[PDB]
Design a protein around this ligand. Structure first.
Ligand code: MOO
Length: 226
């Protein structure tokens, strides 16, 4: 068997590839999804993950610095974009530009991941700072421990808007995109793939995630191949 810990934004793609790999190999693939921060900390505490996929470089560096992944056993796999979402039926179009006043466009709460630890929230905080919006945005936040909890809060109408990845908006018929953050507002969204346990089964799955077959699933879900 092989145990894969993956950022919550990767739930649907990795579930699809788990099914494909189990049809092609006599190996069992076990998956665990959560915020990249939670998963890295769990690995640090001894969780038996063979493979880790983070939604930012920071949480893979965190493991590298603890010597839990080698520089040569990680690769940048996927990219994404950062988006604003609204519940379906409460559509908006908001330009993510310093000229926009967040106090006039955001008249309720704003749902995203914890801005200090969950990658989606860290990317969001970079963007708000670059836009000069941080001190007006912070009082509006509801912070969650992964991007999918935030997505669900928006789908259920507990927040007027949310900040999730483009791939999250596309997976949910209950939310719609209200704005795309320009790339120059934040660090590039990069998913490093890391081989944590070096054994025969884990190495095959690590390679499989880079394969032509895996590229097609990731592209289906809206990710970019790096
Ligand atoms: O680690 Mo996530 O995909 O930003 O919740």
């Amino acid at each position: 068997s092989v145990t894969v810990y993956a950022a919550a934004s990767l739930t649907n793609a990795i579930n699809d590839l788990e099914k494909i790999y189990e049809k092609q190999n006599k190996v069992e693939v076990k998956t665990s999804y959560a915020g990249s921060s939670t998963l890295a900390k769990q690995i640090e505490a001894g969780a038996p993950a063979d493979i880790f996929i983070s939604a930012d470089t920071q949480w893979m560096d965190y493991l590298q610095n603890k010597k839990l992944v080698a520089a040569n056993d990680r690769i940048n796999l996927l990219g994404n974009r950062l988006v604003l979402i609204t519940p379906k039926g409460q559509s908006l179009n908001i330009k993510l530009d310093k000229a926009t006043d967040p106090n006039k466009v955001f008249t309720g709460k704003i749902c995203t991941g914890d801005t200090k630890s969950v990658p989606v929230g860290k990317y969001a905080k970079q963007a708000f700072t670059n836009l000069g919006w941080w001190n007006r945005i912070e009082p509006k936040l509801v912070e969650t421990e992964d991007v999918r909890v935030a997505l669900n809060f928006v789908a259920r109408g507990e927040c007027q808007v949310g900040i999730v990845y483009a791939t999250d908006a596309a997976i949910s018929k209950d939310v719609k995109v209200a704005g795309i953050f320009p790339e120059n507002t934040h660090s590039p969204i990069i998913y490093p793939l890391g081989l944590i346990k070096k054994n025969s089964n884990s190495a095959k799955f690590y390679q499989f995630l880079q394969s032509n077959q895996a590229k097609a699933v990731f592209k289906k879900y809206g990710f970019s191949m790096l």
